[PDB]
Design an enzyme around this catalytic site. Sequence first.
Site, PDB file in Angstrom:
ATOM      1  N   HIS A  85       0.867  -1.180   0.000  1.00 27.60           N
ATOM      2  CA  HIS A  85       0.000   0.000   0.000  1.00 27.60           C
ATOM      3  C   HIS A  85       0.903   1.229   0.000  1.00 27.60           C
ATOM      4  O   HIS A  85       2.128   1.105  -0.009  1.00 27.60           O
ATOM      5  CB  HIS A  85      -1.086  -0.020   1.085  1.00 27.60           C
ATOM      6  CG  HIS A  85      -0.631   0.097   2.496  1.00 27.60           C
ATOM      7  ND1 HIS A  85      -0.224  -0.990   3.245  1.00 27.60           N
ATOM      8  CD2 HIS A  85      -0.635   1.166   3.334  1.00 27.60           C
ATOM      9  CE1 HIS A  85       0.040  -0.572   4.475  1.00 27.60           C
ATOM     10  NE2 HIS A  85      -0.215   0.721   4.560  1.00 27.60           N
ATOM     11  N   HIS A  87       1.564   3.770   2.174  1.00 21.08           N
ATOM     12  CA  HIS A  87       2.143   4.392   3.368  1.00 21.08           C
ATOM     13  C   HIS A  87       3.662   4.192   3.422  1.00 21.08           C
ATOM     14  O   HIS A  87       4.242   3.316   2.762  1.00 21.08           O
ATOM     15  CB  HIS A  87       1.487   3.831   4.628  1.00 21.08           C
ATOM     16  CG  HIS A  87       0.072   4.245   4.794  1.00 21.08           C
ATOM     17  ND1 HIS A  87      -0.778   3.599   5.656  1.00 21.08           N
ATOM     18  CD2 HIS A  87      -0.625   5.288   4.300  1.00 21.08           C
ATOM     19  CE1 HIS A  87      -1.955   4.190   5.658  1.00 21.08           C
ATOM     20  NE2 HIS A  87      -1.887   5.229   4.850  1.00 21.08           N
ATOM     21  N   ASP A  89       5.678   2.954   5.571  1.00 19.60           N
ATOM     22  CA  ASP A  89       6.192   1.650   5.973  1.00 19.60           C
ATOM     23  C   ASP A  89       6.186   0.630   4.833  1.00 19.60           C
ATOM     24  O   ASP A  89       6.702  -0.472   5.010  1.00 19.60           O
ATOM     25  CB  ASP A  89       5.483   1.107   7.218  1.00 19.60           C
ATOM     26  CG  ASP A  89       3.965   0.936   7.074  1.00 19.60           C
ATOM     27  OD1 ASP A  89       3.314   1.775   6.466  1.00 19.60           O
ATOM     28  OD2 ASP A  89       3.451  -0.022   7.718  1.00 19.60           O
ATOM     29  N   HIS A 150      -7.283  -1.780   5.869  1.00 19.04           N
ATOM     30  CA  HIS A 150      -6.389  -0.790   6.460  1.00 19.04           C
ATOM     31  C   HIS A 150      -6.246   0.431   5.565  1.00 19.04           C
ATOM     32  O   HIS A 150      -6.122   1.561   6.064  1.00 19.04           O
ATOM     33  CB  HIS A 150      -5.039  -1.463   6.703  1.00 19.04           C
ATOM     34  CG  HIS A 150      -3.955  -0.497   7.014  1.00 19.04           C
ATOM     35  ND1 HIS A 150      -3.771   0.067   8.265  1.00 19.04           N
ATOM     36  CD2 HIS A 150      -3.032   0.056   6.205  1.00 19.04           C
ATOM     37  CE1 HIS A 150      -2.763   0.913   8.206  1.00 19.04           C
ATOM     38  NE2 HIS A 150      -2.293   0.909   6.975  1.00 19.04           N
ATOM     39  N   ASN A 181      -3.050   1.861  13.025  1.00 20.42           N
ATOM     40  CA  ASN A 181      -3.250   3.209  12.511  1.00 20.42           C
ATOM     41  C   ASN A 181      -4.380   3.173  11.494  1.00 20.42           C
ATOM     42  O   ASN A 181      -4.213   2.660  10.380  1.00 20.42           O
ATOM     43  CB  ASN A 181      -1.979   3.777  11.906  1.00 20.42           C
ATOM     44  CG  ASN A 181      -2.066   5.250  11.760  1.00 20.42           C
ATOM     45  OD1 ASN A 181      -3.148   5.782  11.494  1.00 20.42           O
ATOM     46  ND2 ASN A 181      -0.948   5.948  11.950  1.00 20.42           N
TER      47      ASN A 181
HETATM   48  C1  LIG Z   1       3.284   4.734   8.375  1.00 24.18           C
HETATM   49  C2  LIG Z   1       2.045   4.232   8.965  1.00 24.18           C
HETATM   50  C3  LIG Z   1       2.057   4.034  10.507  1.00 24.18           C
HETATM   51  C4  LIG Z   1       2.683   4.889  11.386  1.00 24.18           C
HETATM   52  C5  LIG Z   1       2.680   4.606  12.794  1.00 24.18           C
HETATM   53  C6  LIG Z   1       2.097   3.501  13.345  1.00 24.18           C
HETATM   54  C7  LIG Z   1       1.396   2.618  12.409  1.00 24.18           C
HETATM   55  C8  LIG Z   1       0.675   1.453  12.568  1.00 24.18           C
HETATM   56  C9  LIG Z   1       0.377   0.741  13.907  1.00 24.18           C
HETATM   57  C10 LIG Z   1       0.594  -0.718  13.959  1.00 24.18           C
HETATM   58  C11 LIG Z   1       0.351  -1.404  15.033  1.00 24.18           C
HETATM   59  C12 LIG Z   1      -0.081  -0.768  16.193  1.00 24.18           C
HETATM   60  C13 LIG Z   1      -0.296   0.683  16.215  1.00 24.18           C
HETATM   61  C14 LIG Z   1      -0.023   1.453  15.008  1.00 24.18           C
HETATM   62  C15 LIG Z   1      -0.714   0.864  17.738  1.00 24.18           C
HETATM   63  N1  LIG Z   1      -0.780  -0.389  18.384  1.00 24.18           N
HETATM   64  C16 LIG Z   1      -0.364  -1.306  17.382  1.00 24.18           C
HETATM   65  O1  LIG Z   1      -0.269  -2.511  17.665  1.00 24.18           O
HETATM   66  C17 LIG Z   1       0.312   1.085  11.315  1.00 24.18           C
HETATM   67  C18 LIG Z   1      -0.620  -0.109  10.865  1.00 24.18           C
HETATM   68  O2  LIG Z   1      -1.604  -0.367  11.621  1.00 24.18           O
HETATM   69  O3  LIG Z   1      -0.454  -0.567   9.744  1.00 24.18           O
HETATM   70  N2  LIG Z   1       0.752   1.917  10.432  1.00 24.18           N
HETATM   71  C19 LIG Z   1       1.432   2.930  11.047  1.00 24.18           C
HETATM   72  N3  LIG Z   1       0.868   5.209   8.685  1.00 24.18           N
HETATM   73  C20 LIG Z   1       0.827   6.704   8.867  1.00 24.18           C
HETATM   74  C21 LIG Z   1      -0.474   7.121   8.538  1.00 24.18           C
HETATM   75  C22 LIG Z   1      -1.198   8.135   9.143  1.00 24.18           C
HETATM   76  C23 LIG Z   1      -1.538   8.711   7.788  1.00 24.18           C
HETATM   77  C24 LIG Z   1      -1.407  10.275   7.410  1.00 24.18           C
HETATM   78  N4  LIG Z   1      -2.344  11.151   8.355  1.00 24.18           N
HETATM   79  C25 LIG Z   1      -0.585   7.841   7.250  1.00 24.18           C
HETATM   80  O4  LIG Z   1      -1.327   5.781   8.538  1.00 24.18           O
HETATM   81  C26 LIG Z   1      -0.482   4.803   8.597  1.00 24.18           C
HETATM   82  O5  LIG Z   1      -0.817   3.564   8.640  1.00 24.18           O
HETATM   83 ZN   LIG Z   2       1.272  -0.572   8.516  1.00 23.27          ZN
HETATM   84 ZN   LIG Z   3      -0.516   1.708   6.420  1.00 22.59          ZN
END
Ligand SMILES: C[C@@H](c1cccc2c(-c3ccc4c(c3)CNC4=O)c(C(=O)O)[nH]c12)N1C[C@]2(C[C@@H](CN)C2)OC1=O
Ligand SMILES: [Zn+2]
Ligand SMILES: [Zn+2]
Length: 232
Positions: A85, A87, A89, A150, A181
């Site tokens: 995707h 993002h 990561d 997601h 997230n």
């Molecule tokens: C890059 C990515 C991102 C950033 C930070 C943390 C995560 C997590 C995430 C995973 C697992 C747990 C949590 C959090 C809390 N407890 C968990 O266990 C995930 C996911 O769940 O994949 N991804 C994240 N980003 C940014 C963003 C915000 C958008 C712009 N406003 C783009 O969305 C996104 O996914």
């Molecule tokens: Zn992620």
């Molecule tokens: Zn993501």
Amino acid sequence: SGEYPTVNEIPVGEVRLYQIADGVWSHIATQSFDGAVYPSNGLIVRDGDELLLIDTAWGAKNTAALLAEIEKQIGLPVTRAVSTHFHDDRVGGVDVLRAAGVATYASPSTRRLAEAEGNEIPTHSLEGLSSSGDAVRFGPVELFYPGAAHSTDNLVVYVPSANVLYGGCAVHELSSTSAGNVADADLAEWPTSVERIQKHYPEAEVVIPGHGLPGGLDLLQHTANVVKAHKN
Ligand SMILES: C[C@@H](c1cccc2c(-c3ccc4c(c3)CNC4=O)c(C(=O)O)[nH]c12)N1C[C@]2(C[C@@H](CN)C2)OC1=O
Ligand SMILES: [Zn+2]
Ligand SMILES: [Zn+2]
């Protein structure tokens, strides 16, 4: 020492690999975002005498470290990468890959979203994935678009030789109480998209989430449960 790596066992700025099955590894790295530290996974799949990479290691320096760790531990060239995707990561590090000679791929939906949001942009478009339930072959894997979860563009990856299902960020680890997230998620459609994965890959033996520990098929039902409860 053989357990699945976490943030507590990856030295600062480094990447670790974990052998999942014959010719299948996950990669694990850590990154800070909004003042908290997170692990994240990707996949490496042996493609004859080359390697297919799924997802970056969440950043340019992490992804350079990933390439170095692959050379140390595996010693075969990474020739193609797919980002599951848009993002950071998943695509942060695509510029590093592209300058190392790796051909980078993503769906057109992922490419559009990455471009619009200012993330790094894979070079090549993966057609044939625009409708939920679509699947295409890509070297030693099948790519599957389950529907919005997601993110609207999230893809999953199946390794048929090993019955490994890489769910990416549409799938959460068993210890997760949280839906992760959800900024770009579709909580209403996510359970339906997970059901499509469950129906399409009933023989999966290992399920790998986008963040956290691999397990079995139960990660799928668990994910649907946590997403419904978050929505509730
Ligand atoms: C890059 C990515 C991102 C950033 C930070 C943390 C995560 C997590 C995430 C995973 C697992 C747990 C949590 C959090 C809390 N407890 C968990 O266990 C995930 C996911 O769940 O994949 N991804 C994240 N980003 C940014 C963003 C915000 C958008 C712009 N406003 C783009 O969305 C996104 O996914
Ligand atoms: Zn992620
Ligand atoms: Zn993501």
